[PDB]
Structure 1
Amino acid sequence: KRQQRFFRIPFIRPADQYKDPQNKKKGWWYAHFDGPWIARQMELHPDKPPILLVAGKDDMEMCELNLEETGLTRKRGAEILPRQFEEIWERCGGIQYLQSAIESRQARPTYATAMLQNLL
């Protein structure tokens, strides 16, 4: 519970990189690190469905760097409370997504899988 750390990075599309403010459509990237390694990754996009990614199943798509090598703990305003991650995760259908990666046996065991399995 104390080794669990949560980060958020607002972003804009590289296509809107050099446009005026009113044309920069914002999304948000989220990561849940279980100790050094990302257990859950989540992306809110302005123009497509949310992307949900869990360790094991989605390893090739997710951030590959550990917490120390991301530098996120050194980026001011990046860190968020657990609740700020979970509220979004839940609204995006993250529980059904994680549960499905467990049952299909694609998910790597993490603090996140343990918490869901405790519920079920």
Structure 2
Amino acid sequence: ARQQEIDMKRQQRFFRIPFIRPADQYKDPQNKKKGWWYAHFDGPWIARQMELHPDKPPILLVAGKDDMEMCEKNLEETGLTRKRGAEILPRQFEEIWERCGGIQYLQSAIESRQARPTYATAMLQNLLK
């Protein structure tokens, strides 16, 4: 069943990491746009992904659809966890998620059965009201 897929009984971890682009990093100390990478991992994998770059629009990625775009490494295989407190709050993630159009993207794959009902999709269904 739908809920059977989502199943809100797994691990939920959200993180973020503000890293500067190498190219801009050295070519110009001032002209070094900072890119923020956030990802809401679920258990050993992830279900929500969002990228923000001063030069690159809000790249909203999700499991199933942008499985190749989003993080392709388990929590330990990611690195954000190893960092110095990469974790974050769900309020911030959903803050930007709505600030751009993540829900719309999810609702699109959700209906097309591409979003892969894992957790965000269900959370989205509730976030719709």
Q: 1:119 to 1:7 in 2, by over 3 A?
A: closer
SS in 1 for 2:50: strand
**Match among 58, 61, 69 for residue 61 of structure 1:** 69
SS in 1 for 2:27: coil
SS in 2 for 1:17: helix
> Cα offset for 1:14?
2.7
> Cα offset for 1:119?
4.8
1:33 aligns with 2:41: yes
Residue pairs, 1:1-120, within 5 angstroms = 3-119=11-127
SS in 1 for 2:54: coil
> Cα offset for 1:3?
1.9
Deviates more, 1:1-10 or 1:63-72: 1-10
Contact 2:17–2:80 (CA under 8 A) maintained in structure 1: no
**Matched residues, percent identical?**
99
Q: 1:12 to 1:119 in 2, by over 3 A?
A: closer
> Cα offset for 1:72?
2.1
Structure 1 ranges of 4+ moved more than 3 A: none
d(CA) in 1 for partners of 2:120, 2:110: 11
> Cα offset for 1:71?
3.0
Contact 2:14–2:41 (CA under 8 A) maintained in structure 1: yes
d(CA) in 2 for partners of 1:104, 1:2: 24
> Cα offset for 1:80?
0.7
CA deviation string 1:63-98 (max 9, x = no partner): 111112223222113111111211111102111111
Contact 2:21–2:33 (CA under 8 A) maintained in structure 1: yes
TM-score, normalised relative to structure 1 = 0.88
TM-score, normalised relative to structure 2 = 0.83
Q: How many residues align?
A: 120
Gaps of at least 5 residues in structure 1 are none
> Cα offset for 1:20?
4.2
CA deviation string 1:5-49 (max 9, x = no partner): 111011222321213432211121110111111101111111132
d(CA) in 2 for partners of 1:21, 1:118: 43
> Cα offset for 1:2?
7.4
